[PDB]
């Protein structure tokens, strides 16, 4: 498979990952969207 990157994000980059993980905790109980 493809496993040769540290903190990539799957469908985003490192600068997106840092915020991706921030939303990961603030989105479990919804983020005022739907």
Coordinates of C-alpha atoms in Angstrom, one line a residue:
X1 CA 0.0 0.0 0.0
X2 CA 1.1 3.7 0.3
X3 CA 2.6 4.3 3.8
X4 CA 5.6 6.7 3.5
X5 CA 4.4 10.1 5.0
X6 CA 4.2 11.6 8.5
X7 CA 0.9 13.4 9.3
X8 CA -0.4 13.7 5.7
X9 CA -4.3 13.9 6.3
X10 CA -5.5 11.2 3.7
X11 CA -7.7 13.7 1.7
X12 CA -5.6 16.9 2.7
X13 CA -2.0 18.1 3.4
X14 CA 0.0 18.8 6.6
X15 CA -1.2 22.5 6.9
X16 CA -4.8 21.1 6.5
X17 CA -4.1 18.1 9.0
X18 CA -3.3 20.4 12.0
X19 CA -6.8 22.1 11.5
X20 CA -8.3 18.7 10.4
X21 CA -7.3 17.2 13.8
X22 CA -8.7 20.4 15.6
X23 CA -12.1 19.9 13.8
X24 CA -11.8 16.1 14.5
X25 CA -12.6 16.9 18.2
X26 CA -15.0 20.0 17.6
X27 CA -17.0 18.1 14.9
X28 CA -17.9 14.8 16.9
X29 CA -20.9 16.7 18.4
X30 CA -21.6 18.6 15.1
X31 CA -20.1 22.0 14.2
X32 CA -23.4 24.1 13.7
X33 CA -23.8 22.5 10.2
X34 CA -26.7 20.1 9.3

